Amino acid sequence: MNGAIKVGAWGGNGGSAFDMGPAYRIISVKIFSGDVVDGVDVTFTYYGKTETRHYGGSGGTPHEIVLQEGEYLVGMAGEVANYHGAVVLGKLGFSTNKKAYGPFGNTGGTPFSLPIAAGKISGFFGRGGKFLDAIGVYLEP
Amino acid sequence: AIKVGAWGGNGGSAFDMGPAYRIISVKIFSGDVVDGVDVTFTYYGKTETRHYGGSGGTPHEIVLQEGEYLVGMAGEVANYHGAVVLGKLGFSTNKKAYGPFGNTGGTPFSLPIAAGKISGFFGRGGKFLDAIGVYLEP
Ligand SMILES: CO[C@H]1O[C@H](CO)[C@@H](O)[C@H](O[C@@H]2OC[C@@H](O)[C@H](O)[C@H]2O)[C@@H]1O
Ligand SMILES: CO[C@H]1O[C@H](CO)[C@@H](O)[C@H](O[C@@H]2OC[C@@H](O)[C@H](O)[C@H]2O)[C@@H]1O
Ligand SMILES: CO[C@H]1O[C@H](CO)[C@@H](O)[C@H](O[C@@H]2OC[C@@H](O)[C@H](O)[C@H]2O)[C@@H]1O
Numbered sequence: 001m002n003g004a005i006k007v008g009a010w011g012g013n014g015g016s017a018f019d020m021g022p023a024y025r026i027i028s029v030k031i032f033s034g035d036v037v038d039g040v041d042v043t044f045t046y047y048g049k050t051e052t053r054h055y056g057g058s059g060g061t062p063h064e065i066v067l068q069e070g071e072y073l074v075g076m077a078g079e080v081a082n083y084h085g086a087v088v089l090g091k092l093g094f095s096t097n098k099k100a101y102g103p104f105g106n107t108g109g110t111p112f113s114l115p116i117a118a119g120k121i122s123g124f125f126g127r128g129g130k131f132l133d134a135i136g137v138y139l140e141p
Numbered sequence: 142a143i144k145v146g147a148w149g150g151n152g153g154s155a156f157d158m159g160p161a162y163r164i165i166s167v168k169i170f171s172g173d174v175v176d177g178v179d180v181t182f183t184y185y186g187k188t189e190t191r192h193y194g195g196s197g198g199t200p201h202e203i204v205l206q207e208g209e210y211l212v213g214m215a216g217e218v219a220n221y222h223g224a225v226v227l228g229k230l231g232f233s234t235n236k237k238a239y240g241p242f243g244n245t246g247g248t249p250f251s252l253p254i255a256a257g258k259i260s261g262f263f264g265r266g267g268k269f270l271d272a273i274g275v276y277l278e279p
């Protein structure tokens with residue numbers, strides 16, 4: 001709504017829906033992984049107030065992406081597959097107009113990729129439970 | 142503008158349809174792979190048609206009804222007798238899913254659109270549909 005563009009929601013239908021909504025500016029993204037992707041922590045700006053959100057499960061190790069001045073998320077890729085009877089993100093990575101990150105996780109599966117030729121990622125939405133079942137993004141020029 | 146993707150190889154020649162006011166229909170030509178696609182859409186009062194890719198293949202057409210948009214595109218890019226091209230391609234409207242069309246698998250890709258729509262295409266084409274991307278709008 002309000003002219004938002006939300007693409008994807010890659011993963012399984014398990015867990016419970018989460019939605020960060022779009023950010024005025026993303027400060028950092030911390031991906032937590034082990035065999036698969038556990039969760040994602042996002043620190044951003046909204047209404048001139050800094051916020052942090054915790055999505056997915058609490059396990060895994062942290063991998064942090066800090067966006068410098070003028071750096072933006074222009075790509076997201078990963079893999080979805082089964083893990084103990086549940087379809088979730090086995091791998092996840094991002095790219096910025098400066099460098100690529102990840103992928104993080106170790107469980108292979110059905111790949112997916114979202115290279116962005118024009119525009120950037122501005123927020124996240126998806127599904128979380130014990131792990132990160134599904135992840136999608138908000139886009140903007 | 143929001144341009145996502147460009148799934149496929151680096152062969153062929155670049156093509157950019159640019160955004161449309163409203164897409165009318167899309168025809169996908171496929172055989173072993175995805176030969177090409179035709180797009181009929183309105184644009185500032187005029188009705189236009191564009192073709193990307195080669196001339197081979199059999200067509201599969203998607204005709205959008207009133208208040209019907211493309212909210213998804215899936216397929217598979219792979220190495221066909223030496224050329225990295227789209228081996229399979231399909232689309233989804235807010236009411237039905239089409240294809241994918243083509244019979245050559247490879248590394249998959251998919252783009253469900255929870256909010257917004259596909260307003261145009263861009264990519265690369267030659268004898269076949271080398272690569273394809275889309276423009277997105279609210
Ligand atoms: C099976 O355990 C491995 O895979 C899990 C899923 O990716 C992952 O969460 C596990 O990591 C641990 O989770 C619990 C935390 O308290 C630990 O610090 C963390 O290492 C593990 O990688
Ligand atoms: C191990 O189960 C927990 O973690 C899973 C992966 O994160 C997650 O999918 C599970 O959620 C359940 O999935 C099946 C649905 O029918 C349930 O309503 C949902 O809670 C669970 O969080
Ligand atoms: C069979 O070759 C034609 O069809 C291919 C698939 O569509 C296409 O990739 C080919 O394009 C050439 O690829 C190699 C480049 O170096 C050339 O410049 C390009 O024309 C060709 O159209």
Ligand SMILES: CO[C@H]1O[C@H](CO)[C@@H](O)[C@H](O[C@@H]2OC[C@@H](O)[C@H](O)[C@H]2O)[C@@H]1O
Pocket residue numbers: 171172173174175176196197198199
């Ligand atoms: C190898 O031939 C099959 O796969 C090709 C790539 O998808 C495809 O183009 C071929 O289709 C034919 O192309 C030439 C036209 O004149 C034919 O009518 C058409 O069937 C074929 O599917």
